[PDB]
Ligand binder design. Structure first.
Ligand SMILES: [Ca+2]
Ligand SMILES: [Ca+2]
Ligand SMILES: [Ca+2]
Ligand SMILES: [Cl-]
Ligand code: NA
Ligand code: NA
Ligand code: NA
Ligand code: NA
Length: 473
């Protein structure tokens, strides 16, 4: 039968496989014959050590570029502090070589791996766009363990070039099937940050991935939000194990940590899934993640069952990825119908927020039209509002099926008086629900202060299809 890797640190890779059920079920996918052969992954980060003993065999210059110095070679810049170790650590998680007596193995240890050196310098809009749009008919999957500052007061996302890169990627990338963008949801847990204030994670074009500790808890660094899709293991406290990967200067590390370690594991699992069905679209991939991810034994105080019987948490999305279940479901997967977009402008007049504002609206979700949606994918509440202290706001959106999504939780450090300017708060929690019916938006002041402001626009944007539903869970 299948023989598991013999690498010296493979037994330390607790998150890949084990008797204990606290893993991503990756060996089961390996046993089905999927190891990433023929799939190309690129790490958008601070560079990749292309000559690393556990990366060299899988390295792909076609999946690589150096946008910081404008050359083809993504070799990290070496410093005493080893500042530029981050990308190499991420790459090893995806595609470290197996059975070569070195370190551990990648989730997709036969995939090809590249890196874009783009974090080691000023990260402009143009820098991001040129990275996100690198060789989009060669690279299948992009992994990004970076984003806006996690100070818990920033609201920021892709500017014009980067957003255009996303739309070009999902539309024309991978032969029209769409580039797969995998994002780390953030490290702002300590600052009480929300990953919905991050336009990269909040994007419908990215699969935003959160973290769980070995013992199944929400890590200190974790950011909760409704835009998160699913979860992979990463670090926790000092009694919990961490991530084993390739390190700078041709070394091995057993202490890769934080949100940074979760996205690459998801990218690796998605690589195995694409090997099992190369015809999957970018939206297909998100459907697979929703259907197969596992809540069980993940601890959270906010698990809720949505309209179609799936458990969902703001800390974890639909739960832990399950590689075995992903590759199995992928094989006979029927391509989803083309994406519809139903735009519903909710307000007829501006509304003062005060202590609390509730906006109720019954919608038909474009009944009778080509964009009629009976099967929701992503939903956005695009909000424009003024307020004197942004971080005192909490915002909830309730679907017709009764699913309460927290669009925005209180952010104690966010003192901004700039409000929100058509910010597209996104939720994945009503996936596969029928969006026809009453939606409810709640905006409330969570502090005792006499705050003030006005909601001047609320566009409900629904994405999805009108066919192909499963019997609820
Ligand atoms: Ca270079
Ligand atoms: Ca190895
Ligand atoms: Ca953040
Ligand atoms: Cl759109
Ligand atoms: Na911005
Ligand atoms: Na397309
Ligand atoms: Na996303
Ligand atoms: Na309804």
């Amino acid at each position: 039968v299948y023989q598991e890797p013999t690498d010296p640190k493979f037994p330390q890779q607790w998150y890949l496989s084990g008797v204990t059920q606290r893993d991503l079920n990756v060996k089961a996918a390996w046993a089905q014959g999927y190891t990433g052969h023929g799939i190309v992954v690129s790490i958008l980060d601070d560079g990749i050590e292309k000559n690393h003993p556990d990366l060299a065999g899988n390295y792909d210059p076609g999946a690589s570029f150096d946008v910081n110095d404008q050359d083809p070679d993504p070799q990290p810049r070496y410093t005493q502090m080893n500042d530029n170790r981050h990308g190499t650590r991420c790459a090893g998680e995806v595609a470290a070589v197996a059975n070569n007596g070195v370190c551990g193995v990648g989730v997709a240890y036969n995939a090809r791996i590249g890196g874009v050196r783009m974090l080691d310098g000023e990260v402009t809009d143009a820098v991001e766009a040129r990275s996100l749009g690198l060789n989009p008919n060669h690279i299948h999957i992009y992994s990004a363990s970076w984003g806006p500052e996690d100070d818990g007061k920033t609201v920021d996302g892709p500017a014009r070039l980067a957003e255009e890169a996303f739309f070009r990627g999902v539309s024309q990338g991978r032969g029209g099937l769409g580039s797969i963008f995998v994002w780390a949801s953030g490290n702002g847990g300590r600052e009480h940050d929300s990953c919905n204030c991050d336009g990269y994670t909040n994007s419908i074009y990215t699969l935003s991935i959160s973290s769980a500790t070995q013992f199944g808890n929400v890590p200190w660094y974790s950011e909760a939000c409704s835009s998160t899709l699913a979860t992979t293991y990463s670090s926790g406290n000092q009694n919990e194990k961490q991530i084993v990967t390739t390190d700078l200067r041709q070394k091995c590390t057993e202490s890769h940590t934080g949100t940074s370690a979760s996205a690459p594991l998801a990218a690796g699992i998605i690589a195995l899934t694409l090997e099992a069905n190369k015809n999957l679209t970018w939206r297909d991939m998100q459907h697979l993640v929703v259907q197969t991810s596992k809540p069980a034994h993940l601890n959270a105080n906010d698990w809720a069952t949505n309209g179609v019987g799936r458990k969902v948490s703001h800390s974890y999305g639909y739960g832990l990825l399950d590689a075995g279940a992903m590759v199995a479901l992928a094989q006979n997967w029927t391509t989803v119908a083309p994406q519809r977009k139903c735009i519903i402008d909710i307000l007829t007049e501006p509304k003062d927020i005060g202590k609390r504002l509730e906006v109720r609206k019954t919608v038909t979700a474009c009944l009778g039209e080509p964009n009629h949606i009976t099967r929701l994918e992503h939903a956005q509440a695009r909000l424009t509002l003024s307020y004197n202290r942004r971080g005192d706001l909490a915002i909830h959106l309730v679907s017709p099926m009764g699913t309460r999504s927290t669009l925005l939780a209180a952010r104690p450090h966010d003192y901004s008086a700039d409000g929100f300017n058509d910010w597209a708060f996104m939720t994945t929690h009503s996936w596969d629900e029928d969006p026809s019916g009453e939606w409810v938006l709640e905006i409330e002041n969570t502090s005792e202060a006499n705050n003030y402001g006005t909601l001047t626009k609320f566009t409900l944007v629904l994405y999805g299809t009108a066919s192909g539903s499963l019997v609820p869970r």
